[PDB]
Ligand binder design. Sequence first.
Ligand SMILES: Nc1ncnc2c1ncn2[C@@H]1O[C@H](COP(=O)(O)OP(=O)(O)OC[C@H]2O[C@H](O)[C@H](O)[C@@H]2O)[C@@H](O)[C@H]1O
Ligand SMILES: Nc1ncnc2c1ncn2[C@@H]1O[C@H](COP(=O)(O)OP(=O)(O)OC[C@H]2O[C@H](O)[C@H](O)[C@@H]2O)[C@@H](O)[C@H]1O
Ligand SMILES: [Gd+3]
Ligand SMILES: [Gd+3]
Lengths: 187, 187
Amino acid sequence: FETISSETLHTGAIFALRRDQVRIVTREVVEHFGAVAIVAMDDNGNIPMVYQYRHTYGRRLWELPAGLLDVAGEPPHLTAARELREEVGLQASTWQVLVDLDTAPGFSDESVRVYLATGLREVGRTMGWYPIAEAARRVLRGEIVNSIAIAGVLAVHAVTTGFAQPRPLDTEWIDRPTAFAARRAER
Amino acid sequence: FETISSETLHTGAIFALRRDQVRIVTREVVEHFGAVAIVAMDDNGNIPMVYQYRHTYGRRLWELPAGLLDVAGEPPHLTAARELREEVGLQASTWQVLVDLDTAPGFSDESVRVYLATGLREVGRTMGWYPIAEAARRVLRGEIVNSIAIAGVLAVHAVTTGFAQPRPLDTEWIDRPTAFAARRAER
Ligand SMILES: Nc1ncnc2c1ncn2[C@@H]1O[C@H](COP(=O)(O)OP(=O)(O)OC[C@H]2O[C@H](O)[C@H](O)[C@@H]2O)[C@@H](O)[C@H]1O
Ligand SMILES: Nc1ncnc2c1ncn2[C@@H]1O[C@H](COP(=O)(O)OP(=O)(O)OC[C@H]2O[C@H](O)[C@H](O)[C@@H]2O)[C@@H](O)[C@H]1O
Ligand SMILES: [Gd+3]
Ligand SMILES: [Gd+3]
């Protein structure tokens, strides 16, 4: 395949719409910052989840703490750690890579890195705590549909059941977005 | 929350970009057809997966057979069944709902229904067959990143391990997209 020509159709707050001419057909791409989410598992196998309104669906969805990689030059896990604190007031001693997911492969370059945070300390001074198994059943029951949450919950469930292991922070993030950030549309 | 006003910024082949004024801030939404995917498990616990090029990432990703709900008035599972046949030349006697996922909750209304198809017959006249456990490990190892694939693979893995059950075809698909189709931008 080959990109013949590409044209910017729109630049917004968190993404830009671009149209390319490929190998020869049209291919519209939503350039995204990319994001990070966190599965913060405590000493008893519970993780915190937030109930957030999503205008796209016109309703609140249960999700993992998460934020966009909108801070230029900021390392992903630093962004992640920041969100875990701001989102659920937790700090973690151990940070590992749990699962990366390409959210909308058909039309956007967004990719999300989900970290597994352990060794939690409540710091600072809607969300709910769920036993990992309870969370896994909510997924398989349709009560958790956010794609990042689904991946993170079922991944940590596979880990907690001894089926798989978390990974090193230096694990390559193959599809981490760069296009939108490269635009630097900020005065 | 409340949508003050909404403006169409772009209408493309598979999606439209719309900007709303919410409750008061800007909220850009990518209206999508929605899609369906299939986890076709054979009698030995294997499922077929396709290796497809995704321009968004500039590379091929391992995925579950899937297609957009771009056929007006066509029932999702009929679309699904059609794709399973066209994509991997398989027909299934049993169709159930496995997992629904909201792909990019932050900027698009797309939602994808993943069905579990069983009782397979090879019909007609790149893809590969994977034991469900092999597929689950590929996910946790980063070799499967497509979000729909991640959800489907780990969901059927939870099913095959006896942790959860498939669901009836009449299960409500809460976030099934309707906006883009409603536009009917076809002469
Ligand atoms: N469609 C949009 N249009 C304009 N602004 C938006 C839009 N969507 C979100 N924003 C905004 O960006 C800011 C949200 O930042 P974060 O809290 O860092 O991230 P978040 O929206 O929760 O997304 C993290 C991740 O989860 C979602 O599943 C989303 O798809 C993304 O990958 C919001 O306060 C608001 O300015
Ligand atoms: N960004 C795009 N711009 C223009 N046309 C596109 C674009 N992306 C895909 N298409 C096209 O739509 C048709 C593909 O249809 P399907 O095979 O029905 O579906 P598919 O693209 O594989 O997507 C199914 C699902 O998987 C992906 O993860 C995608 O995010 C979606 O939910 C392609 O042949 C081509 O016309
Ligand atoms: Gd935030
Ligand atoms: Gd097709």
